[PDB]
Structure 1
Amino acid sequence: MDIKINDITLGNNSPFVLFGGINVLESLDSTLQTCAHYVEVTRKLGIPYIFKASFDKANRSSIHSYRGVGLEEGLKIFEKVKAEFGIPVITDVHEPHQCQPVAEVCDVIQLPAFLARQTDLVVAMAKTGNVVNIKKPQFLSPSQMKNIVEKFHEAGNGKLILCERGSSFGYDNLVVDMLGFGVMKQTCGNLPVIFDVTHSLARRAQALDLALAGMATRLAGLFLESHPALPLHLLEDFLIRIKALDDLIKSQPI
């Protein structure tokens, strides 16, 4: 199943879409600067692009830590991103009440991996009618992603993206099961499957190998972060390699 996001066709047999950006919104000028770089690089490479950022870090290690800009100021920044660049954007939501006002602005809304079982958040996200990115919890098997998809379907929203981010492997370590991509395609109606390489890693060399490995299994998209996280100036070289492999894979019959 393909999903149209403005002029972008997202699907497992279409050219990969980059969901790219930053950890958290810190200010307007820093955000526009980073986004400008992503847009310019992806445009010349001919890679469809959706800008990603969080307005709030809801689970840092300290209560005093910087959470980022917060919701009200966050949305304002997303409005300016879309107007200047004409691209879609994606952000996560942590509380049911945030969903409709966030969805008015942000094209894709994202279910955090920790909150996948928060049924009210799921229903509140579903009702908005927006495209939803489902972060696959590290403690959930790929065969059970269908259970989350079921809930969104019953709440009336079938515009769902499935986002791999690794699986718990002993204590404090993740492994990405490359068979899980196919299992999700087969059991969830071939909904778009994307790969969050950045959060899978918890590394410029290893991030490239892991991204290539994942995209080799024929995916709708790649999800990642940079900091002015991949180093920002290596994005173009990184992406040339990913596009090379994606173009090759996508040109082979299934």
Structure 2
Amino acid sequence: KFLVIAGPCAIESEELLLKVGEEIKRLSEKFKEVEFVFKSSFDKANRSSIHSFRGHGLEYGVKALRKVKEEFGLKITTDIHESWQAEPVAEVADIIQIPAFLCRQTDLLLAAAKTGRAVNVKKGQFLAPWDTKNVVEKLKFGGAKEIYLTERGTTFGYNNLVVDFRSLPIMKQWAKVIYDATGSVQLPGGMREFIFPLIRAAVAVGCDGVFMETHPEPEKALSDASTQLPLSQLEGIIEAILEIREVASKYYETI
């Protein structure tokens, strides 16, 4: 079924995770046609500044995510940054996320695949759509069976990302495709006003799921404060994309 990956960018506390998980659970019960996956990072390992918020560590993060899966029965996904993190994260993560800058790091991909979990690779801002075929091949070689590729924009001049929707049908040739609605509008080194319009475009074109970072109060977020979707707006957007998908799906081109 259609996938909706959502949650706060970073694990600011398992308190926040529980408050967001509660809403994700409610939507999960309301939209039985959709498969929800809770997401949050235990570490922002690639912040621009050395003085920015990274997180509370792997152990604290896995614990918090563990509480979300136990308390709400929701699937989990988080990203890893170095090979050794794949094993401990796989304990709770149903889907292991590979950061965009690291989409070409062979050992990280292999380490994720070895865990037997599903793998979701964020497409690097430097990669062409067709370049992702090799990424999928590495994962298959590593034993991965459930593979996703996430569109999150491509480098367009400096401090700007553009979404080339031609990427969706191209990547669908070798993997399930996810559209990152919040990451695609960020200005590297973003505009929330474009999150909804572009996600509508994503489902009109055709994808297997959407990815959205959401926070009760984005402006207070410790990471991605300018792009995280306010929690209260999630339901409306999901209902909207489901309706558009229902009508547009008749026209999705065959593989």
Pair in the same fold by TM > 0.5: yes
Count of matched residue pairs: 237
| Match status 1:150 vs 2:150 | no
User: Does residue 159 of the first structure (1) align with residue 159 of the second (2)?
Assistant: no
Deviation digits for residues 60-90 of structure 1, max 9, x if unmatched?
Answer: 2332322112100111111111111111010
Scaled by the length of structure 1, what TM-score is found? 0.89
Match of 1:39 among 13, 25, 38: 25
Unaligned residue ranges in structure 2 (runs of 5+): 217-227
1:197-226: CA deviation from partner (whole Å, max 9, x where unpaired): 111002443111100101112211000111
Counterpart of 1:51 in structure 2 is 38
Q: TM-score if structure 2 supplies the norm length?
A: 0.88
Alignment partner, residue 212 of structure 2: 224
Specify which of 105, 115, 120 is matched with residue 118 of structure 1.
105
Name the structure 2 match of 1:6: none
Query: In structure 1, what is the Cα distance between the partners aligned to 2:249 and 2:28?
Result: 18
How far apart in 2 are the matches of 1:253 and 1:227? Answer: 32
Letter in 1 for 2:249: K
Which one of 67, 86, 89 corresponds to residue 102 of structure 1?
89
Of residues 183, 186, 189, the one that matches 1:199 is 183
**How many Å apart are 1:250 and its aligned residue?**
3.0
1:212 equivalent among 200, 213, 217: 200
Structure 1: 5+ residue stretches without partners: 1-13
Residue 246 of structure 1 corresponds to which residue in structure 2?
Answer: 245
**Residue type matched to 1:22 in 2?**
P
Please state if 1:25 is matched with 2:11: yes
Alignment partners' CA distance in 1, 2:237 and 2:92: 30
Q: Which has the higher contact order (CA 8 A, sep 6+)?
A: 1
State the match for 2:235 in structure 1.
236
CA distance in 2, matches of 1:135, 1:122: 11
Matched to 2:12, the amino acid is E
SS at match of 1:235: helix
Deviation (angstroms), 1:48? 2.0
* Partner SS state of residue 211, structure 2: strand
Q: Which amino acid aligns with 1:198?
A: T
| CA–CA distance in structure 2, aligned partners of residues 88 and 44 of structure 1 | 16
AA matched with 1:183? I
- The one-letter amino acid paired with 2:14 is L
1-structure distance, mates of 2:47, 2:206? 34
- How far off its partner does 1:253 sit? 7.0
Does residue 85 of the first structure (1) align with residue 72 of the second (2)?
Answer: yes
Over 3 Å counting, the alpha-carbon distance change for 1:124 and 1:210 in structure 2 is same
Q: Structure 1 residue 128 and structure 2 residue 115: aligned?
A: yes
The amino acid across from 1:245 in the alignment is I
User: Cα offset for 1:110?
Assistant: 0.8
Residue type of the partner of 1:109? I
Q: What's the Cα RMSD here?
A: 1.5
Cα distance change on mapping 1:180 and 1:253 into 2, 3 Å: closer
